[PDB]
Design a binder for this molecule. Structure first.
Ligand SMILES: Nc1ncnc2c1ncn2[C@@H]1O[C@H](CSCC[C@H](N)C(=O)O)[C@@H](O)[C@H]1O
Ligand SMILES: Nc1ncnc2c1ncn2[C@@H]1O[C@H](CSCC[C@H](N)C(=O)O)[C@@H](O)[C@H]1O
Lengths: 212, 218
């Protein structure tokens, strides 16, 4: 069984992935995804989640007192706390495999310039904390990153959801003047495998030379 | 003014586009985002969008005929056709800057094992086509990739407006749970604050992303 708790100021962002879980998996207790509005843990009538950065400059920083109360309530000693951030370690398929056998993931979704660093520092003294980037681009908030992480992790949990793969084809054999490569129809399955390997090599050279 | 069309067999999965920054840019009229159900272009009783691969292998491939009809209707020669795929060129901040100047993005979201390669090949005979990966992991579908791409592009479009990681940030109170904000940040010395932030950035980068500074990855 896996529990995923997401904490966010935009809880509606995660509702479609919640509803996408198959009922059989939920009923079997294989997976439970819960979403929490961070504003439940604000202190003031204005429900403030952010404040000006120490040292100056633009933007805002999310408040440690609010996040600290949220994580105190949601996390336990078994929690793996995931903090999406463009300044994080890379989230990769290896990470997804590792996290797919965790009992409890908590995803803390940030906004503005991120979460006051003492939140992660303090949490790390009582649980495991993982600051991760999903790619070399900047989002406005952690919610889209949470969606990517949830999808990549949960498709590796049974019954829930080096070289590049080459092109794929289906019927019809000829379409808009373009034929499916005839080798694929040849019934020479060793040759087909070699053809696919060369297609993957060429595609990796063209698109991802870093991988070779 | 930008137009983004998203084509998917799961249109409800794109509802998050109405939240947060993409939602506000939608409300401000700077961008119009339309989501289309690919099954609208099917003709059979069962609305079939997939068929088994040629050459063997597991899974299913999205049929070219249905996609070709959809893109015929939605795209023009001016369109930038975005095809998310883990086998694509990397989508990066540079890509986001480039696409932020485009008049029309169409995002073709795959499912199953992906879309028959001739769909992209055919589209490229009349428009620009970009097959892109959003990262070194595997999603079940292109819908989450579309949301990432839309968010990263929309925050750059004029009307809403480096090679290093940003260091840590702090806000009030100055002491919390016995944990202090670094004193330099409280000191008011702008030059010492700038130098500390630059050092924190470079130290975080070599620890977390040594590749960005030209060092081996672990
Ligand atoms: N590449 C990425 N990977 C994971 N999370 C990201 C991300 N890019 C942005 N985020 C999320 O979005 C939040 C704000 S981005 C932080 C800086 C600010 N957006 C700016 O540059 O002006 C982050 O704290 C993180 O939660
Ligand atoms: N890293 C990534 N970047 C962009 N899109 C991705 C992606 N991973 C998955 N997708 C999307 O999800 C769809 C199905 S994944 C495609 C099959 C894959 N070879 C597999 O291992 O099963 C793709 O066609 C693409 O639209």
């Amino acid at each position: 069984s896996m529990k995923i708790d997401v904490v966010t100021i935009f809880p509606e962002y995660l509702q479609p992935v919640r509803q996408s879980l198959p009922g059989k998996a939920i009923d079997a207790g294989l997976v439970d995804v819960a979403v929490h509005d961070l504003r439940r843990w604000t202190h003031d009538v204005h429900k403030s989640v952010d404040d000006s950065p120490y040292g100056g400059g633009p933007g805002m920083v999310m408040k440690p007192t609010v996040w600290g109360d949220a994580l105190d309530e949601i996390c336990t000693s078994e929690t793996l706390l995931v903090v999406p951030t463009p300044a994080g370690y890379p989230f990769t398929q290896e990470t997804a495999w590792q996290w797919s056998t965790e009992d409890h993931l908590v995803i803390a979704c940030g906004r503005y310039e991120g979460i006051d660093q003492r939140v992660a520092d303090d949490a790390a003294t009582r649980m495991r904390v993982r600051e991760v980037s999903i790619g070399d681009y900047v989002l406005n908030g952690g919610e889209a990153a949470a969606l990517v992480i949830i999808e990549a992790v949960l498709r590796l949990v049974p019954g829930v959801l080096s070289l590049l793969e080459g092109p794929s084809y289906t019927r019809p054999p000829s379409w808009r003047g373009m034929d499916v490569p005839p080798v694929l129809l040849s019934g020479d399955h060793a040759k087909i495998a070699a053809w696919r390997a060369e297609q993957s090599r060429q595609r990796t050279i063209e698109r991802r030379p870093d991988l070779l």
